[PDB]
Amino acid sequence: QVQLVESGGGLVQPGGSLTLSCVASESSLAPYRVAWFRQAPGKEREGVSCISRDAHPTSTYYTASVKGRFTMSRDNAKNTVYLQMNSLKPSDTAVYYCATDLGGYCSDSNYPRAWWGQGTQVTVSS
């Protein structure tokens, strides 16, 4: 029933920074895990990161392609999770989606995939 809104993507130069926001409405994301996905045309949807309801570093999961560069944070009061990209690479150019379910804790292999947002386009080029 929950709908998500991805925003913040745009034309950025290689090595730049960005901050995506996955706005959740009509439902509260506080007791539920949130996951980030990106999908450039041609390739299937791939995981980016997955934050849990506790927002703990142990429950904080990032994919290999984003380790050490992409960071997330959540503020359940405003019902939205951020995704902070640092030193953006052209390989990161993809349509970024955020997905969530009724599960509360992420894992290295399990990401929520129940409800998705419309997605935002992050372009890393000149």
Place this chain on the structure above:
Amino acid sequence: LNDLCFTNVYADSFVIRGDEVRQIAPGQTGNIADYNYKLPDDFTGCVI
């Protein structure tokens, strides 16, 4: 406690990752402490 006297002491069978010892004790919930092993907010006995 080495020579403290007690009544009705029982052991427990539970295996934890080890990095969430503070999480097993009440006041914190985690991936395994939140669901699998739970302690009351007023729990007797120590953690060994």
